[PDB]
């Protein structure tokens, strides 16, 4: 449930970053790190299952 809360919170932060985007390099790096973060947590949820 902590993991789910973190997922919801950082989805909110992704929405906030999307709103704030419109430095471009900062945004691109942030999106890349967020995607790696998303796949990592999908793996973590799978291993918790």
Residue 10, Ramachandran bin (φ over 0: left; ψ between -120 and 50: alpha; else beta): alpha
**What is the x/- site pattern for other proteins, positions 1-40, by CB under 8 A?**
-----x--xx--x--xx--x--x--xx-xx--x--xx--x
Q: Would you say 6 or 45 has its CB closer to other proteins?
A: 6
11 phi/psi in degrees, rounded to 5: -60, -40
Tell me the angle at which helices 24-48 and 2-21 cross, rounded to the nearest 10 degrees. 160
Q: Which residues bind other proteins (CB under 8 A)?
A: 6, 9-10, 13, 16-17, 20, 23, 26-27, 29-30, 33, 36-37, 40
């Amino acid at each position: 449930m902590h993991l789910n809360v973190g997922l919801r919170k950082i989805k909110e932060t992704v929405d906030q970053v999307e709103e704030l985007r419109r430095k471009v390099n900062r945004s691109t790096a942030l999106l890349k790190s967020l995607s790696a973060e998303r796949e990592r947590w999908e793996k973590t949820s799978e291993t918790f299952k």
